[PDB]
Amino acid sequence: VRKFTEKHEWVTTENGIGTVGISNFAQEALGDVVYCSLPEVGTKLNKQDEFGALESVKAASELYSPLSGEVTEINEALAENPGLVNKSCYEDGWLIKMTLSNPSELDELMSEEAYEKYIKS
């Protein structure tokens, strides 16, 4: 169960924890990622709040929150291997993990098959 945002961010939930990353379409557009600006653990985010940024060799994009919640963990493997988000955007290349202050916000995100039509139409 993977939902998407209009800014090409995905989220998956398990045990009340949302794992946030960027889609495969976005990382392909961005290229080889070099630096990931991630928020400190404990940051309280609102939906669509700008919580970070990604810098690639030939591109840069901002990261916007798909949910309202509190940041619980950041992917520490991105400091030594930032290329994980390019070739593991849905698994090892995740960015942050957060709580869900308002789980009903998941209905505002599009499904995985609605997002493929979103980028192809």
């Binding site: 090409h8 976005a26 557009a29 961005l30 630096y35 810098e55 591109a59 840069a60 994009s61």
Partner: peptide
């Protein structure tokens, strides 16, 4: 670091 005048959209 990438300057801001080189950032484009997806």
């Amino acid at each position: 670091r990438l300057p801001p005048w080189l950032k484009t959209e997806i």
